[PDB]
Amino acid sequence: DTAKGVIPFSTSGATWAVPRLSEDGITSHFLRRRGYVTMTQGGSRDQNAAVRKILSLIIAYDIQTQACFFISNEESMRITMAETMGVKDRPNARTNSWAEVSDSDINRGIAKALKEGNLTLDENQKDGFMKLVHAFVADILAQSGHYKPVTSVTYFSAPIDMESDYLDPFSIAIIRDVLDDSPFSELRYDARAMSELEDRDVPITRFSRVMAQMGNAMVRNIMVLNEAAQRKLRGLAVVGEIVHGRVRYLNDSFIQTLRSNINFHLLTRTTPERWAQSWIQAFGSLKGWVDAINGIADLSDLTPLIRDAATSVEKFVTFAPLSFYQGLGSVTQIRALDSSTNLAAVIVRYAAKEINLIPAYQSFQVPTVDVGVKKTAIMDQRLSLQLPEFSEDQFFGMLEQRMQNMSDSEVAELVDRIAKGETPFGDVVKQLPGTSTLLVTNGYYMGGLLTNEDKIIPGDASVPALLYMQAASFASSVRFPPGEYPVFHHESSNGDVRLTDQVSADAQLSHSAVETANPLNFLVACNVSVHTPSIAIDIIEPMPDLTRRGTTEYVHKGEIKVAAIPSLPPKSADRKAQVSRETAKFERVLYKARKGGAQVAAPIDLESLFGIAVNLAVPTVKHVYSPDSKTKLALDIIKGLESDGDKAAATRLLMTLARAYTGTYSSLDEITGIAAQPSDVAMQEFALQSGVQTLKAVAKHTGIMEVATIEMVEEKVRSLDDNRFYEIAAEVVLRALK
Amino acid sequence: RDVLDDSPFSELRYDARAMSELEDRDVPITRFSRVMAQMGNAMVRNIMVL
Fold it and tell me: What is the DSSP letter of A620?
């Protein structure tokens, strides 16, 4: 709606802007995290140019631009060259044409000119800056060329942080576009000058000079980017407040998709300084310009600024169903025993790829002096370490049933019970935010998909983003009042709509019309369900790629872990002498037979599992859904079924869960396991208990998962029925024999 | 005595690229240690394998 100025409406499908999902392996968004971007120094001129590009996009302006002013300053560059080659930074100082420069030489040169440079840098600046100026000098001095890299070295720098900025991915998108065309991506050379450098016997003065002018052009290059960025922002701070109507007849294709964008609308309400900054140069301030096009409506042709902004915003920001995205969310509604016309639970299952198993490689360790880091030389894959491997399907299965057999009043009780802070199921089941039904999500528990930001819905209930969005994406049109929340409308005929008491106070409701400022209401109770979820959440390079590994050495803080296995004493029975002690010094199985009931103690020999003289190097997986936050799901579902009482269900899930934890390392030295006798169970009990306790000891010495969460289970499995212990233990000796 | 047959001192495996840097004149001595170091560093692994 756009009669004669601006006025309210309510698109039933409003859209919030999310980050356009990339597979680029250089960023981390709030649903997808990236630990480390893998990187490289030296090797060859081309390898350094691949990196110089990725560095072009990772490191932010203030570090990048700072480096360009460093390069533009001759007196600084004279010193980095003068020191790179063994000579003084003086007008009469000569370097040869046969001199070959290792990257080692460049860096200690740059370092020396930072040091005398007398400019103050953060630890972060100093690090990013040293990598740009290195990648620039190793390209000049390849073109020169005196570069002759002694080797390739791999470091890991960290990705672009879009972990916050749920609310504003627009200024992130602008900046990130403009970085593509950044002065560090491709260096433009002067061939005439470069010939002077190829020449022997060159004075060092001729080297600084040409690098200076190259920099001096990069500085201009940036002044142009810092302009074409602030031109785009100018355009965004024009869309608001034409959208709120402090300025005046345009319903552009862009402006339209942003008038029904909850994100934009909030950010723009009172005008954002970050975007109004850009008008201080042109007119200044924004209010000076705003008065201009309100004198005019009573320095025009405004439609390219908006178009400029768009191409950027568009290529980095997809707008979402409160349309797409109608996932990634398995929405299955479930109604009380009082079938119609009101429901109890709304299940929302976000899925993503996990990793079932992790490869492990024999490594040796290479000296450096830092503690600090370690260099390691990963050689051969020699195992693949196993995880739990339990399907999250069945757990929500027993939970569906439970919520169906929930009567109408039973439910509204559990809700109040929960709304008072009680959390019977953990964060699996919560109050549906601002509605009187409850929801049953996966993703409070995974990737932190759901976390609650509290301005989106009117009123007092804070609400997770990817619901508000997945719900609003089921809305047919969307009304946009200046200075208020978006009001949504859903119109889908005819009978597939319920008239219910559960919806928040603001909601109008008929059969096939729903009109509320709180989208989740469209699950109370419009017939809205999605069998399987739209978009599985993906990780590119979840593990650091040791695919190069025959040819390069690696440097890692935490991203690779090396195994500090304790070695057993080699002795028929000197093992047995320390195993029983119940306080000695290599990993063991330590259970207390539930068949009454002496203490068992058996040594765990990681030696013979991992290989004989081998220090497993094991990558750390940056998971989306981590064994620890999954197992911690199941256990919270089991606990919450344990009351309100479904012993039948709860005790079946705990069984499933158990089978998975004990299965993997069972079975993998008779006379050693003590105390025991040739019982047929006491023995098949060992089979369970070593199967978890060796998985535990493996997860201790290789950072696969927290030991914490294995003991969390071990405990819930001691408390498992004595009759069941031995059903699963039969199952595990029968699997083991084959 | 078997394992000694396949010992790192019996036949030395060279890196041709690095060795060209050495053939070059006029070489700094630093370029000589380095390449010998890595040759050794491989002999050390060679032994860890024996």
Answer: P
3-state secondary structure of A339: coil
What are residue A257's phi and psi, to 5 degrees? -65, -15
**Torsion of Cα atoms, A403 then A409 then A411 then A415, to 10°:** 180
For helices A647-663 and A681-701, give the axis angle rounded to 10 degrees.
70
Tokens read off for A169: 């991915």
Task: Tell me the nearest-neighbour CA distance from A151 into chain B, angstroms.
Answer: 10
Single out the residue of A653, A604, A655, A605 nearest to residue A633, CA to CA.
A653
| Chain B neighbors of A364, CB-CB under 8 A | 45, 48
Q: How many CB pairs under 8 A join A and B?
A: 14
What's the half-sphere exposure (Cβ side, CA atoms, 13 Å) at A111? 8
Strand A374-386 and strand A554-556: pairing? antiparallel
Please indicate the experimental technique that yielded this structure: cryo-EM
Q: What whole-number distance in Å separates Cα of residue A490 and Cα of residue A525?
A: 11
**A576: which residues sit within 8 A by CB, 6+ positions away?**
A671, A672, A674
What DSSP string runs through A350-412?
A: --B---SEEEEEEEEEE--S-SS-EEEEEEEEEEEEE-----SHHHHHHHHHHHHS--HHHHH
After which residues does chain B become discontinuous at a C–N distance over 2.5 Å?
none
Sign of CA dihedral A433, A163, A373, A625: positive
User: Cα dihedral angle (A478, A347, A414, A337), rounded to 10 degrees?
Assistant: 100
A98: chain B residues, CB-CB within 8 Å: 24-26
Closest partner residue to B26 (CB to CB) among A98, A364, A377 is A98
d(CA A340, CA A180): 56
Question: What separation in angstroms does the CA of A481 have from each of A290, A307, A486, A665, A703?
Answer: 20, 24, 7, 61, 52
The gap from C-alpha A425 to its chain's centroid, in whole angstroms, comes to 26
Chain A residues lying within 8 Å of B26, measured CB to CB: 98
- Taking residue A328's Cβ as centre, other Cβ atoms within 10 Å add up to 22
- Select from B21, B26, B45 the Cβ nearest to the Cβ of A364: B45
